[PDB]
Design a protein around this motif. Structure first.
Motif, PDB file in Angstrom:
ATOM      1  N   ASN B  53       0.848  -1.240   0.000  1.00  0.00           N
ATOM      2  CA  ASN B  53       0.000   0.000   0.000  1.00  0.00           C
ATOM      3  C   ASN B  53       0.831   1.214   0.000  1.00  0.00           C
ATOM      4  OD1 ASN B  53      -2.487  -1.525  -0.074  1.00  0.00           O
ATOM      5  ND2 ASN B  53      -2.844  -1.428   2.077  1.00  0.00           N
ATOM      6  N   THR B  54       1.956   1.278   0.746  1.00  0.00           N
ATOM      7  CA  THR B  54       2.894   2.404   0.690  1.00  0.00           C
ATOM      8  C   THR B  54       3.411   2.733  -0.703  1.00  0.00           C
ATOM      9  OG1 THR B  54       3.573   2.376   3.011  1.00  0.00           O
ATOM     10  CG2 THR B  54       4.971   3.478   1.559  1.00  0.00           C
ATOM     11  N   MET B  55       3.882   1.681  -1.459  1.00  0.00           N
ATOM     12  CA  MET B  55       4.368   1.833  -2.805  1.00  0.00           C
ATOM     13  C   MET B  55       3.293   2.415  -3.782  1.00  0.00           C
ATOM     14  SD  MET B  55       6.634  -1.719  -3.447  1.00  0.00           S
ATOM     15  CE  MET B  55       7.295  -2.400  -1.889  1.00  0.00           C
ATOM     16  N   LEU B  56       2.071   1.870  -3.659  1.00  0.00           N
ATOM     17  CA  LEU B  56       0.906   2.352  -4.360  1.00  0.00           C
ATOM     18  C   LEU B  56       0.388   3.804  -3.972  1.00  0.00           C
ATOM     19  CD1 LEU B  56      -0.927  -1.157  -4.278  1.00  0.00           C
ATOM     20  CD2 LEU B  56       0.201  -0.112  -6.183  1.00  0.00           C
ATOM     21  N   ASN B  57       0.314   4.113  -2.653  1.00  0.00           N
ATOM     22  CA  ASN B  57      -0.079   5.448  -2.190  1.00  0.00           C
ATOM     23  C   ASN B  57       0.995   6.493  -2.472  1.00  0.00           C
ATOM     24  OD1 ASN B  57      -2.732   4.510  -1.461  1.00  0.00           O
ATOM     25  ND2 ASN B  57      -1.974   3.775   0.500  1.00  0.00           N
ATOM     26  N   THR B  58       2.269   6.173  -2.592  1.00  0.00           N
ATOM     27  CA  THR B  58       3.404   7.180  -2.728  1.00  0.00           C
ATOM     28  C   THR B  58       3.482   7.667  -4.157  1.00  0.00           C
ATOM     29  OG1 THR B  58       5.046   5.365  -2.762  1.00  0.00           O
ATOM     30  CG2 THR B  58       4.867   6.732  -0.810  1.00  0.00           C
ATOM     31  N   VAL B  59       2.741   7.113  -5.106  1.00  0.00           N
ATOM     32  CA  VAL B  59       2.622   7.521  -6.487  1.00  0.00           C
ATOM     33  C   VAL B  59       1.593   8.651  -6.534  1.00  0.00           C
ATOM     34  CG1 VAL B  59       1.644   6.886  -8.809  1.00  0.00           C
ATOM     35  CG2 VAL B  59       3.596   5.521  -7.702  1.00  0.00           C
ATOM     36  N   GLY B  60       1.895   9.821  -7.066  1.00  0.00           N
ATOM     37  CA  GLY B  60       0.938  10.920  -7.314  1.00  0.00           C
ATOM     38  C   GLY B  60       0.363  10.952  -8.722  1.00  0.00           C
ATOM     39  N   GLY B  61      -0.918  10.977  -8.894  1.00  0.00           N
ATOM     40  CA  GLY B  61      -1.583  10.741 -10.115  1.00  0.00           C
ATOM     41  C   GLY B  61      -1.657   9.239 -10.451  1.00  0.00           C
ATOM     42  N   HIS B  62      -1.988   8.966 -11.719  1.00  0.00           N
ATOM     43  CA  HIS B  62      -2.303   7.614 -12.257  1.00  0.00           C
ATOM     44  C   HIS B  62      -3.591   7.103 -11.597  1.00  0.00           C
ATOM     45  CE1 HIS B  62       1.856   8.397 -12.748  1.00  0.00           C
ATOM     46  NE2 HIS B  62       1.645   7.964 -14.001  1.00  0.00           N
ATOM     47  N   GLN B  63      -4.504   8.071 -11.162  1.00  0.00           N
ATOM     48  CA  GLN B  63      -5.549   7.598 -10.258  1.00  0.00           C
ATOM     49  C   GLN B  63      -6.762   6.848 -10.965  1.00  0.00           C
ATOM     50  OE1 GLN B  63      -5.175   7.380  -7.093  1.00  0.00           O
ATOM     51  NE2 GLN B  63      -3.283   8.681  -7.105  1.00  0.00           N
ATOM     52  N   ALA B  64      -6.961   6.977 -12.329  1.00  0.00           N
ATOM     53  CA  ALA B  64      -7.843   6.150 -13.034  1.00  0.00           C
ATOM     54  C   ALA B  64      -7.435   4.650 -13.035  1.00  0.00           C
ATOM     55  CB  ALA B  64      -7.931   6.677 -14.499  1.00  0.00           C
ATOM     56  N   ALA B  65      -6.138   4.418 -13.300  1.00  0.00           N
ATOM     57  CA  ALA B  65      -5.576   3.112 -13.127  1.00  0.00           C
ATOM     58  C   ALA B  65      -5.497   2.600 -11.724  1.00  0.00           C
ATOM     59  CB  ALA B  65      -4.121   3.128 -13.690  1.00  0.00           C
ATOM     60  N   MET B  66      -5.139   3.408 -10.772  1.00  0.00           N
ATOM     61  CA  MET B  66      -5.153   3.031  -9.378  1.00  0.00           C
ATOM     62  C   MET B  66      -6.629   2.760  -8.907  1.00  0.00           C
ATOM     63  SD  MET B  66      -1.733   3.049  -7.849  1.00  0.00           S
ATOM     64  CE  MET B  66      -0.194   3.878  -8.175  1.00  0.00           C
ATOM     65  N   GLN B  67      -7.643   3.494  -9.402  1.00  0.00           N
ATOM     66  CA  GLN B  67      -9.009   3.050  -9.096  1.00  0.00           C
ATOM     67  C   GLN B  67      -9.354   1.633  -9.732  1.00  0.00           C
ATOM     68  OE1 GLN B  67     -11.613   3.888  -7.056  1.00  0.00           O
ATOM     69  NE2 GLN B  67     -12.273   1.876  -7.862  1.00  0.00           N
ATOM     70  N   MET B  68      -8.958   1.431 -11.020  1.00  0.00           N
ATOM     71  CA  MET B  68      -9.158   0.118 -11.685  1.00  0.00           C
ATOM     72  C   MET B  68      -8.526  -1.021 -10.936  1.00  0.00           C
ATOM     73  SD  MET B  68      -8.880   0.027 -15.998  1.00  0.00           S
ATOM     74  CE  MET B  68      -7.759   1.423 -16.485  1.00  0.00           C
ATOM     75  N   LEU B  69      -7.261  -0.789 -10.467  1.00  0.00           N
ATOM     76  CA  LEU B  69      -6.444  -1.706  -9.713  1.00  0.00           C
ATOM     77  C   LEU B  69      -7.081  -2.023  -8.324  1.00  0.00           C
ATOM     78  CD1 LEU B  69      -3.748  -3.249  -8.980  1.00  0.00           C
ATOM     79  CD2 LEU B  69      -2.584  -1.045  -8.505  1.00  0.00           C
ATOM     80  N   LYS B  70      -7.667  -1.089  -7.593  1.00  0.00           N
ATOM     81  CA  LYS B  70      -8.529  -1.216  -6.386  1.00  0.00           C
ATOM     82  C   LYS B  70      -9.783  -2.081  -6.637  1.00  0.00           C
ATOM     83  CE  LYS B  70      -6.555   2.676  -3.787  1.00  0.00           C
ATOM     84  NZ  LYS B  70      -5.694   3.220  -4.938  1.00  0.00           N
ATOM     85  N   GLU B  71     -10.584  -1.962  -7.724  1.00  0.00           N
ATOM     86  CA  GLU B  71     -11.682  -2.877  -7.965  1.00  0.00           C
ATOM     87  C   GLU B  71     -11.195  -4.291  -8.162  1.00  0.00           C
ATOM     88  OE1 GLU B  71     -14.895  -0.720 -10.769  1.00  0.00           O
ATOM     89  OE2 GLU B  71     -15.679  -1.801  -9.010  1.00  0.00           O
ATOM     90  N   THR B  72     -10.174  -4.422  -8.985  1.00  0.00           N
ATOM     91  CA  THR B  72      -9.538  -5.713  -9.209  1.00  0.00           C
ATOM     92  C   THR B  72      -8.967  -6.455  -7.903  1.00  0.00           C
ATOM     93  OG1 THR B  72      -8.964  -5.368 -11.490  1.00  0.00           O
ATOM     94  CG2 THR B  72      -7.409  -6.707 -10.311  1.00  0.00           C
ATOM     95  N   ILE B  73      -8.226  -5.709  -7.042  1.00  0.00           N
ATOM     96  CA  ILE B  73      -7.755  -6.100  -5.765  1.00  0.00           C
ATOM     97  C   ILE B  73      -8.988  -6.457  -4.763  1.00  0.00           C
ATOM     98  CG2 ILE B  73      -6.599  -5.161  -3.587  1.00  0.00           C
ATOM     99  CD1 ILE B  73      -4.718  -3.578  -5.472  1.00  0.00           C
ATOM    100  N   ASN B  74     -10.028  -5.639  -4.787  1.00  0.00           N
ATOM    101  CA  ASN B  74     -11.318  -6.008  -4.160  1.00  0.00           C
ATOM    102  C   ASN B  74     -12.024  -7.259  -4.752  1.00  0.00           C
ATOM    103  OD1 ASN B  74     -11.391  -4.000  -1.863  1.00  0.00           O
ATOM    104  ND2 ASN B  74     -11.921  -2.415  -3.293  1.00  0.00           N
ATOM    105  N   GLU B  75     -11.973  -7.479  -6.098  1.00  0.00           N
ATOM    106  CA  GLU B  75     -12.444  -8.689  -6.654  1.00  0.00           C
ATOM    107  C   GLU B  75     -11.698  -9.936  -6.277  1.00  0.00           C
ATOM    108  OE1 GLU B  75     -15.202  -9.516  -8.643  1.00  0.00           O
ATOM    109  OE2 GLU B  75     -15.876  -7.833  -7.285  1.00  0.00           O
TER     110      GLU B  75
END
Lengths: 221, 221, 221, 221
Positions: B53-75
């Motif tokens: 989560n640190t590696m993922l949260n420390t990235v600024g922007g890319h948030q359309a992909a980071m939202q896609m990646l969150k649904e997938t991780i929730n799936e």
């Protein structure tokens, strides 16, 4: 990777950032150049097949070269399977299995299997074997992607001898031949392909002279 | 992270400035290119769900992909809970609970619990499980953000074959189609979409030829 | 041909007029169509090589195909002799001779010999063997006289979906490609190569939609 | 096909030229008109699954409709494998193997197994199961290829009831509707979609009327 310490103690290590970042830059900066092989070999000491497949996979772009290396690995892998017969029936559950070609490429083997085979005594050196395949395919790309031939290297009317010999032993390194064919290119071509002014100087030394005697001789021409 | 050292000495450490940076710069410089997924894997060696989560949260922007990646991780997390029943875990007073999907995805879980699972006898690899689920989600982003179709790769009139083979195997790499499908792409398209000058040459070799024989074949063309 | 009667009395019969007329008409209407090949087996069920030579030799014209076929059979014939060499020293007293590849193609074998091998127990099926060579060679012919690529089959701006699925699977039927790749052609190419209006129709169903679902969905666009 | 002669004597024979031709010509001329399915059943009396595949593979033309039927054949096949699992170990003493869906569909099974199943006591009627699976997919083709639904059958102002009723009992013939439901469709829709003049006369008969009473009432209309 796996680090050998004191008393022959081999302990696994995570891949360092700067081994990764230096390895990408080496391929950005010098592409598929001869000196790139040694840079690879050096950076890859004590790596496992998972770490090596990683180094190869972390290269973005270059997929024509990465694909020529995949066929070469697959051909080598098929070749390893032909030379090393596939076992029949039982395999000892107390002694690890001999690696297949697909195991040497890391495709069909685990990290724990890679670690058993390197750490075990006598070992089966999967890291060092697959690295030798890799180096084999790197030569095929290096030679190919360098459009060079040692016979077309000549010295121009005004060109410093030192620069022509630099060009000659630069071109020669990437040439594919036996050492005897190379020895012959050395004793024959270097003087042949020197300029008329230089040509007289080296023939007057005769074929007994060393590379030093020739290099200080033809210095002012 | 948790680094396993010699004699199985497992020690927790905090995520480094150059780990942090390498991963941030990798997404900034290379975004969702293919080569990012083995680099991610490399840099995330010994990683707990907090470190991930640190590696993922420390990235600024890319948030359309980071939202896609969150649904997938929730799936993949809902899928993990579905497969394995809700249960207390080891019922001794000194023991940690048995992780849910939301605990592996790092949502409902603490850093000490995460440390607990990973050091646990016998080890639960909650860090690596969550990396596979993230890689599965990165791959959906990487395939979608790749602009090209392999069906559109073809060579130009004055285009060098070599640059083309780089584009075909760059695009082929990013495609999800099977090995049998990908072998058909090689045996058909590559030869087929070549320009007239090289096209006649590759047809003169016969359809047994290697990529190597094509590249040496078209080295002057 | 050889007709097996009740209790398995195998007796040879004269080549029937409507066998002869059926095969003649079949070739006149359907030439190099894929449908010729099952018809060829059905009309040759129970045949000898003499009878198979009769049907092939009673074909007027198509003499490019007859040479290609002839070549395919000699290749298959040469190979049958390579794999199956004739036994060392003196012959068994009562037995029938070893069929050689040319015997199997009916070139060097009489009618009686062909009847012996087929009716003898254990049987040597010179008829069914010759048919697979003939079918192999016929599949090459069919495929050669087919020209369109399967990539080139696309829906017209206002073409009925049915007339395109018919064109698609007609061309697919004559493709050489493995079944899994033909499965890949089904899932990728069909919806992809559709026109803006039908494409839209199919896209609204979602990508799980069965051919029954694709055909009723595009029934009128 | 397999001919039953005097006293349970079952004897194998080839699929007849003029059978095969009858089927190709019905489909060439008349496509998938409702009478085609009874014709197919009429022409396949005593056919094996092999003979049934012979007839589908000898269709040229209409490969979207043929594709729809393969998919149907795979559905009907998968359902047979669901209902009756695989039967473990080596076949029961003097007993025939219980066929898979792929065995009924004639792919995993051999013609001699197909002749044994059909001819054995108790017989396994593989030919008639597959024939139902084919008749089901021919009905999906018939129904899909139809342009008019039974709701859509309606009488002209000066149109004879009899010619209209002919369009209705043809359309009713291709409905997948159940028989209690087809009976409502007769007692409701026929008069309702009648012209106002013939409708009046038929409503005057009451709800007890036969088709004959309805045709002889609207004779002069």
């Amino acid at each position: 990777p796996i680090v050998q310490n004191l008393q022959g103690q081999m302990v696994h290590q995570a891949i360092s950032p700067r081994t990764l970042n230096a390895w990408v830059k080496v391929v950005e900066e010098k592409a598929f150049s001869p000196e790139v092989i040694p840079m690879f070999s050096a950076l890859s000491e004590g790596a496992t097949p998972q770490d090596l497949n990683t180094m190869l996979n972390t290269v973005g772009g270059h997929q024509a070269a990465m694909q020529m290396l995949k066929e070469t690995i697959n051909e080598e892998a098929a070749e390893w399977d032909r030379l090393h017969p596939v076992h029949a029936g039982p395999i000892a559950p107390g002694q690890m299995r001999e690696p297949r070609g697909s195991d040497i490429a890391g495709t069909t083997s685990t990290l724990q299997e890679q670690i058993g085979w390197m750490t075990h005594n006598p070992p089966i050196p999967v890291g060092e074997i697959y690295k030798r395949w890799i180096i084999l395919g790197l030569n095929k790309i290096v030679r190919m992607y360098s459009p060079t031939s040692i016979l077309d290297i000549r010295q121009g009317p005004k060109e410093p001898f030192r620069d022509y010999v630099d060009r000659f032993y630069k071109t020669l390194r990437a040439e594919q031949a036996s050492q005897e064919v190379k020895n012959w290119m050395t004793e024959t071509l270097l003087v042949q392909n020197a300029n008329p002014d230089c040509k007289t100087i080296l023939k007057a030394l005769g074929p007994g002279a060393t590379l030093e005697e020739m290099m200080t001789a033809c210095q002012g021409v």
